[PDB]
Write an enzyme that holds these catalytic residues in place. Structure first.
Site, PDB file in Angstrom:
ATOM      1  N   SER A   1      60.873  54.037  45.833  1.00  0.00           N
ATOM      2  CA  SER A   1      61.397  55.123  46.527  1.00  0.00           C
ATOM      3  C   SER A   1      63.098  54.921  46.173  1.00  0.00           C
ATOM      4  CB  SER A   1      61.439  55.200  47.922  1.00  0.00           C
ATOM      5  OG  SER A   1      62.212  55.797  48.569  1.00  0.00           O
ATOM      6  N   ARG A   2      63.852  55.635  45.364  1.00  0.00           N
ATOM      7  CA  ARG A   2      64.875  55.319  44.862  1.00  0.00           C
ATOM      8  C   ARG A   2      66.129  55.801  45.900  1.00  0.00           C
ATOM      9  NH1 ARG A   2      62.550  57.892  40.655  1.00  0.00           N
ATOM     10  NH2 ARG A   2      62.287  57.007  38.616  1.00  0.00           N
ATOM     11  N   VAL A   3      65.531  56.477  47.101  1.00  0.00           N
ATOM     12  CA  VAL A   3      66.513  56.697  47.964  1.00  0.00           C
ATOM     13  C   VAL A   3      66.123  55.927  49.331  1.00  0.00           C
ATOM     14  CG1 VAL A   3      67.249  58.828  49.790  1.00  0.00           C
ATOM     15  CG2 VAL A   3      66.716  59.170  47.299  1.00  0.00           C
ATOM     16  N   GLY A   4      65.782  54.679  48.932  1.00  0.00           N
ATOM     17  CA  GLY A   4      65.539  53.847  49.958  1.00  0.00           C
ATOM     18  C   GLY A   4      66.969  53.368  50.496  1.00  0.00           C
TER      19      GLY A   4
ATOM     20  N   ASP B   1      61.787  61.649  43.082  1.00  0.00           N
ATOM     21  CA  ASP B   1      62.682  60.651  43.255  1.00  0.00           C
ATOM     22  C   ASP B   1      61.867  59.318  43.473  1.00  0.00           C
ATOM     23  OD1 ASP B   1      65.156  62.106  43.380  1.00  0.00           O
ATOM     24  OD2 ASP B   1      64.156  62.880  45.324  1.00  0.00           O
TER      25      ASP B   1
END
Lengths: 125, 57, 55
Positions: free
Chosen positions: A112-115, A87
């Site tokens: 960080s895509r899940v930021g 991710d």
């Protein structure tokens, strides 16, 4: 229902061992003599980390794979394969390390895509 | 050195070269503008020069 | 006025010779990059040939 953190210290050494085995078994080689299922191996390993729904218990498993590059080459086979799966990535550089900037996270390149969702409200603010 | 490092060095040197060329152009323009004032000022200096050289001594 | 124009001339020639030096370094570095990459090309060709032959 527990929460687990798993750290894989060298997927590059894992891949080197797998390549050794494949060459000794005389399977056809790909680029850099790696077998064709080298991406399949790592994807099958990494996809098992997940966040379970509340119907399944609510547990989670998070993973921190490691990749060691040579001379900063991030276009190599294993680095690209692992980059396309995760991710987000964190890049460490000796340039920052010796200039006094340690830990050497290169915030310009790291992603960080899940930021946001992985931060409390004050931290986001 | 690695190709990755060579690319970064080349890109940075391109960017610096562009900055330097732009500033060379700006300095050239300012020089061409300042020459006009430099040549224009002479009459006033020469008038005072001749008058003072005649009278002050 | 003379000093201001001298400043202009000095900065102009400094930028000019700085650009010349930078382009010289770029020539050297890019040509170095290009001599380097043929080694990688021949290495990958050698690897493909060896992989085909060994089977």
């Amino acid at each position: 229902g527990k929460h687990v953190l798993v750290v894989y210290d060298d997927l590059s050494k894992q891949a080197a061992a797998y390549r050794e085995l494949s060459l000794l078994l005389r399977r056809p080689p790909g680029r850099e003599a790696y077998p064709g299922d080298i991406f399949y191996l790592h994807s099958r390993l990494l996809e098992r980390a997940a966040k379970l729904s509340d119907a399944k218990g609510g547990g989670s498993l998070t993973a921190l794979p490691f990749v060691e590059t040579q001379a900063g080459d991030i276009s190599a086979y294993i680095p690209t394969n692992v980059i396309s799966i995760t991710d987000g990535q964190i890049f460490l550089q000796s340039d920052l390390f010796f200039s006094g900037v340690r830990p050497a996270i290169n915030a310009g390149l790291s992603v960080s895509r899940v930021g946001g969702a992985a931060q409390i409200k004050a931290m986001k603010k | 050195a690695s190709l990755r490092d060579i690319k970064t060095r080349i890109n940075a040197t391109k960017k610096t070269s562009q900055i330097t060329k732009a500033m060379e152009m700006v300095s050239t323009s300012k020089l061409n503008r300042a020459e006009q004032n430099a040549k224009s000022f002479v009459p006033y200096m020469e008038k005072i020069q001749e008058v003072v050289a005649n009278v002050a001594l | 006025l003379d000093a201001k124009a001298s400043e202009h001339a000095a900065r102009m020639t400094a930028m000019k010779n700085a650009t010349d030096n930078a382009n010289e370094l770029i020539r050297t570095l890019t040509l170095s990059y290009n001599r380097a990459r043929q080694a990688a090309i021949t290495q990958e060709i050698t690897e493909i040939v060896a992989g085909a032959n060994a089977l």
